[PDB]
């Protein structure tokens, strides 16, 4: 190569840097953290803060390292008297108009401005004049705006324009009277609208739900994962004692970079309401507080009183792999084979992991210049994934959609809306095929709502046909991908949590069980939960399933334990306990093991590591935490092996490929109990 890595000198240190890198990036590679205010890793170069000024030989003026490209043979100095003089002057110019709001500002303790002033600034001020007074702005109930604190670092504008794609914010006025916000009273319609406060380096933009609640140092930080969807964003949990105070995203380039859905940002409030703390057993007067011994005995009697074919188990959205496998072992050990999943398509065959995962991976998806969407809405299925899709769109990647035309914050081509359009595209009737047939790295992605169709085999067969015709899967590349919207689905698929053929037939003729057990499920259909049937519920929130239940075991929430959760690409991730158990709650797999012992068939494991090892024996990849395997590919042999399922229940060419997600702000009980999501819903309803 023509020396892709050029050489410069920073304070007489030779550092090898890639071509096109900036002096900021070079100094970062040099081990120096230059003060900066407007530059960000994920945004365009703004270069208005003037805080990145450095000294270069043969240059009389300080240069903008946040923007200055590095030339070969360049010399960079960072500790000269002029450097410190410029830094102190810039800090002084920052602080002259800034209001003395630190005691009331919520960013005190984690304010970049404050620390940078402490380090690179002076201690005294010679400004004694009247400051500039700025009125606050309304953007919705999620973000509290104190505009007088704004330093005009323009990060909000760049973020809204590029990542969100809404481009609803701008700079009004001029000079000192330059103003930030919207000229009109507008509500921030961005779904990833909470990232701006984190991106705001000052207290000008603050989380309204978090305002004046607690301080940064009062918190204990626990790195966690997001369970509100199937992407599994890496997050950190901040708490004061047993109470969650705020949840913040953390860096994971291969999953979510530095971004979090506002649904995954503000749903922590629900953990304070409708909480189940004590076991309940339905008496003649109704459900009453009873001991774990009494509840477990009642559950064992109810389970043993019925035949094995009259017991059904259902897994919710937020059940972990450990509890799922424990309950599956429990029900299998008693001759029961009725399994169901709250995430749908519980009867979908799961023999090859690639058939129900994203084989391109999330970061490998960025290598594709052409992307095909088949009946999915990534904006409401995974807004972080939609943001990454937009980032891919920003550098030439074209996207096609087959399904309902919806706002996706970037231009795209609508091929069609029904399976007939997909068949026409596969036949050669549409120009999009030739664009697919000419793309070097084409990509096809299918959502979970397609898997909820009764004709899912036919849709999969058509998709496989199109992939074969366009060569989407070939040597060294796999553009075929399967996504999801719930965490517990992937672990259930990998562990084989699927109903028996006998139970499928029993549903076919209409057999109705009598013992029904819920593992944190609240969005069941009426057909799987007959009325008049005994219900044993395990959960951590009082909701519809809890109300109809007859015996209730207060379980553990994802913020209180460490459960295994694998995202739709097949990467194993685990949560982490940030606060202790609420009330008399117990460990979910411990609860199931206790029930197994009480009934009369003990589970062979007695520890968390033991059940995880049982999972590993069931599927080896469970051991690899925070990694992913390359799934095997079996070409059209799988499709030709599931041809009978295609023959039965033939294709429906009329039903549109829609998204089953109709309420972004409310998908589970925790979302259904969160006050903040309800406030956002009312705000979106008060605009008309």
């Amino acid at each position: 190569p023509p020396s892709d890595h050029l050489e410069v000198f920073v304070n007489e240190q030779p550092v090898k840097i890639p071509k096109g890198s900036s002096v900021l990036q070079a100094c970062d590679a040099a081990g120096i953290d230059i003060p900066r205010f407007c530059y960000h890793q994920r945004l365009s170069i703004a270069g208005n803060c003037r805080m990145c000024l450095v000294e270069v030989e043969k240059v009389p003026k300080p240069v903008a390292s946040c923007a200055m490209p590095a030339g070969p043979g360049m010399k960079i100095k960072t500790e000269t008297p002029m450097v410190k003089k410029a830094r102190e002057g810039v800090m002084e110019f920052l602080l002259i108009n800034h209001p003395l709001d630190c005691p009331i500002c919520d960013q005190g303790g984690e304010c970049d401005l404050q620390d940078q002033a402490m380090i690179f600034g002076s201690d005294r001020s010679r400004f004694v004049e009247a400051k500039r007074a700025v009125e606050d702005k309304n953007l919705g109930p999620l973000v509290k705006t104190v505009m007088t604190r704004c330093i005009q670092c323009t990060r909000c504008v760049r973020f809204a324009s590029e990542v969100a794609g809404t481009a609803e914010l701008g700079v009004t006025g001029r000079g000192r009277d330059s103003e930030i916000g919207t000229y009109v009273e507008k509500l921030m319609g961005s779904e990833l609208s909470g990232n701006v406060v984190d991106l705001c380096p000052v207290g000008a933009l603050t989380s309204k739900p978090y305002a004046f609640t607690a301080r940064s140092w009062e918190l204990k930080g626990t790195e966690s994962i997001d369970v509100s969807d199937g992407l599994g964003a890496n997050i950190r949990v901040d708490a004061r004692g047993t109470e969650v105070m705020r949840i913040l995203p953390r860096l994971n380039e291969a999953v979510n970079e530095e971004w979090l859905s506002d649904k995954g940002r503000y749903q922590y409030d629900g953990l304070k309401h409708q909480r189940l703390d004590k076991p309940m057993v339905k008496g003649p007067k109704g459900l009453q507080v009873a001991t774990w011994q009494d509840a477990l005995g009642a559950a064992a009697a109810a389970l043993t009183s019925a035949a094995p074919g009259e017991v059904r188990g259902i897994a919710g959205k937020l059940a972990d792999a450990e509890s799922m496998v424990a309950l599956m072992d429990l029900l299998r050990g008693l001759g029961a084979g009725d399994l169901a999943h709250e995430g749908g398509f519980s009867d979908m065959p799961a023999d090859v992991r690639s058939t129900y995962t994203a084989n391109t991976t999330v970061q490998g998806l960025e290598q594709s210049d052409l992307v095909l969407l088949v009946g999915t809405n990534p904006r409401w299925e995974s807004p972080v994934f939609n943001a990454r899709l937009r980032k891919m769109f920003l550098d030439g990647t074209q996207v096609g959609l087959v399904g309902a035309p919806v706002d996706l914050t970037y231009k795209y081509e609508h091929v069609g809306s029904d399976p007939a359009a997909l068949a026409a595209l596969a036949a050669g009737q549409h120009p999009f095929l030739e664009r697919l047939k000419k793309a070097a790295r084409p990509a096809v992605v299918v959502g979970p709502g397609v898997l909820r169709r009764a004709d899912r085999e036919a849709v999969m067969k058509a998709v496989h046909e199109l992939c074969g015709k366009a060569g989407v899967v070939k040597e060294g590349w796999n553009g075929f991908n399967v996504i999801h919207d719930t965490a517990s689905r992937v672990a259930a698929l990998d562990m084989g949590f699927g109903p028996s053929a006998a139970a499928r037939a029993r549903r076919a003729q209409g057999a109705q069980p009598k013992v029904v057990y819920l593992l944190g499920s609240d969005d069941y259909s009426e057909e799987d939960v007959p009325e008049g049937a005994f219900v044993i519920y395990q959960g951590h929130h009082g909701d519809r399933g809890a109300s109809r239940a007859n015996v209730v075991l207060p379980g553990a929430a994802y913020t209180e334990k460490s459960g295994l959760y694998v995202n739709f690409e097949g990467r194993v991730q685990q949560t982490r306990a940030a606060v202790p158990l609420v009330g008399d709650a117990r460990e979910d797999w411990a609860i199931l093991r206790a029930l197994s012992e009480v009934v009369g068939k003990r589970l062979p494991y007695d520890s968390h590591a033991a059940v995880r090892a049982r999972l590993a024996g069931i599927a080896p990849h469970f051991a690899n935490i925070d990694a992913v395997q390359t799934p095997v590919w079996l070409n059209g042999e799988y499709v030709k092996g599931v041809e009978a399922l295609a023959k039965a229940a033939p294709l429906q060419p009329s039903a549109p490929l829609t998204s089953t997600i109709s309420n972004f702000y409310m998908t589970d009980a925790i979302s259904r109990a969160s006050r903040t999501m309800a406030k956002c819903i009312q705000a979106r309803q008060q605009t008309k």
Binding site: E243, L271, K272, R275, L276, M280, L287
Partner: protein, 73 residues
């Protein structure tokens, strides 16, 4: 109060002159009286009418300081 003399009944505006902290008294200094000013009186320590924390058994309505709501059927 000849039988139950107690220093707590001395008003603060005489407390400073009594304690040799200032040379100001009501007879020669006109202080500013807030509208929310509470007068001085005897202590109630040792009695059942004295102050108690909100989690005390003597409180009018006991407080359960659990930071969440329990679900009721």
């Amino acid at each position: 109060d000849k039988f139950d003399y107690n220093p707590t009944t001395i008003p603060p505006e005489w407390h400073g002159w009594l304690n040799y902290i200032n040379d100001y008294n009501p007879t020669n200094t006109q202080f500013k009286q807030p509208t929310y000013q509470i007068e001085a009186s005897m202590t109630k320590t040792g009695t059942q009418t004295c102050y108690n924390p909100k989690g005390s058994w003597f409180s009018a309505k006991p407080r359960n300081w659990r930071k969440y709501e329990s679900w009721t059927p």
